[PDB]
C-alpha cells in the first residue's frame, strides 16, 4: 500500500474510489494500491 | 468458586518424588455457614463463613443475635466467600484436593514507616565520593516551574505492609482432613497465626 499526499492512477487499470472518508486507488496490479495520507 | 477461612501455621518442607517441596501449612477447617448472601436479598451471592469458636462471655448482644439466627456457636471471625454456595452448613478442607491450585489472601507483615529503599526498591545515594547525607534519600521528586508540582501516586517514604495481599495459583500439596490441615506449595502473606483466606484459583 502506497501512502502519499498525491494519489493518482498509475496505469489504465487503476480505479480511484472513496471509501470511509479516504481516497484509494485500487488496481489488479498490487503495486498500484494507494491510500491518501 | 469455593473458599474457606484459615490460619497460617508455619512453613516446613516435605519430600515428594525425591524433591523438597517448600510448603506453608494452613489450618482451614472448619467453617460454619453463618449467612448466605442471595441476589434476592443482598444483590449478589456469597457465603458468610465463621472461624474459630469464641468465648461467649466476650460476644455482645448484636453479634449473639446474629449467630442465633444461624444456630451457630459464637465465632471469632466472620468473612464472606464471594460467589460460593456450599451444600452443607459447614465448610471444611475437603473442598480441596491435592493437585488443585488455590489463591491465598492474608495481611502482610507491617514494616511501619518505611524508607524509599525498603518500600520502593529505590537505589538511594552513593556511600562515598562526597555524597552528603543522602545515602538513603530518594533524590529528585519533580521538575521545575512546569508542572511546578509533584504527581499524585508519587513513590515516597511512608507506611508499608500490614495490608491485604493475595498471592495466586498455589499448588495444594496435601490435605490432612483429620486435623483440618491444608498444605500449600510456596509462600503465603503475613505472620504465623495470621488469618488467611483460601479460594479456588482464578488462574487457568
Amino acid at each position: 500500500m502506497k501512502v502519499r499526499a498525491s494519489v493518482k492512477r498509475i496505469c489504465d487499470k487503476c480505479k480511484v474510489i472513496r471509501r470511509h472518508g479516504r481516497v484509494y486507488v485500487i488496481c489488479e496490479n498490487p503495486k498500484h494500491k494507494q491510500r491518501q495520507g | 468458586m469455593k473458599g474457606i477461612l484459615g490460619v497460617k501455621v508455619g512453613m516446613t518442607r516435605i519430600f515428594r518424588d525425591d524433591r523438597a517441596v517448600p510448603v506453608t501449612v494452613i489450618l482451614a477447617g472448619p467453617c460454619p455457614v453463618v449467612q448466605r448472601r442471595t441476589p434476592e436479598k443482598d444483590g449478589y451471592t456469597a457465603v458468610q463463613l465463621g472461624f474459630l469458636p469464641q468465648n461467649p462471655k466476650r460476644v455482645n448482644r448484636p453479634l449473639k443475635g446474629h449467630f442465633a439466627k444461624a444456630g451457630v456457636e459464637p465465632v471469632r471471625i466472620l468473612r464472606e466467600i464471594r460467589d460460593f454456595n456450599p451444600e452443607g452448613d459447614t465448610v471444611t478442607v475437603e473442598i480441596f484436593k491435592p493437585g488443585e491450585r488455590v489463591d491465598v489472601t492474608g495481611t502482610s507483615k507491617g514494616r511501619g514507616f518505611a524508607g524509599v529503599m525498603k518500600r520502593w526498591n529505590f537505589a538511594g545515594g552513593p556511600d562515598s565520593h562526597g555524597a552528603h547525607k543522602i545515602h538513603r534519600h530518594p533524590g529528585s521528586i519533580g521538575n521545575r516551574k512546569t508542572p511546578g508540582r509533584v504527581y499524585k501516586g508519587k513513590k515516597m517514604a511512608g507506611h508499608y505492609g500490614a495490608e491485604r495481599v493475595t498471592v495466586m495459583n498455589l499448588e495444594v500439596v496435601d490435605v490432612i482432613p483429620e486435623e483440618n490441615l491444608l498444605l500449600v506449595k510456596g509462600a503465603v502473606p503475613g505472620p504465623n497465626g495470621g488469618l488467611v483466606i483460601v479460594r479456588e484459583t482464578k488462574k487457568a
Binding site: - | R13, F15, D18, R19, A20
Partner: protein, 122 residues
Amino acid sequence: MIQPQTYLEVADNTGARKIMCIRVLKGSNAKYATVGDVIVASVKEAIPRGAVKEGDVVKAVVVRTKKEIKRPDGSAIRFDDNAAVIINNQLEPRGTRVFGPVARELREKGFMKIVSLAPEVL
C-alpha cells in the same frame, strides 16, 4: 555466581590457567552465571605454547562455583574455586582433559563430553 570481572581457574588442558569473565551469555542482561552457564572471558594467564594464549577472548562453561548450587532434592554442593572449561561455539571442549570434579548439572545441560572427561561428577 560469576559476573564480569570475576576470575575463574581453568579446569582443562588448553593452556589457559585463569580467565576473567566479561559477559554472562544468558539473555539480555543476566547478572550471574552458575554451573552449566556459558560466559565470554578474557584469558588472563596461560602456560606457554598452549591452545589459547593470554589476551584471547574465549567462551567457556562454568563447571565449579564457590557459591553453593542448590538441587531439587533439597541438597546443595559447593566447590573451593570457580572453574570453567573452555569450549567452542558448538559447546564442545577445546582441550582433551578435564581436571577436577564438575557439577552434575552439566550433564542435565548437554555438556556430556565434559561430564565424560571429568574424573568425578558430583
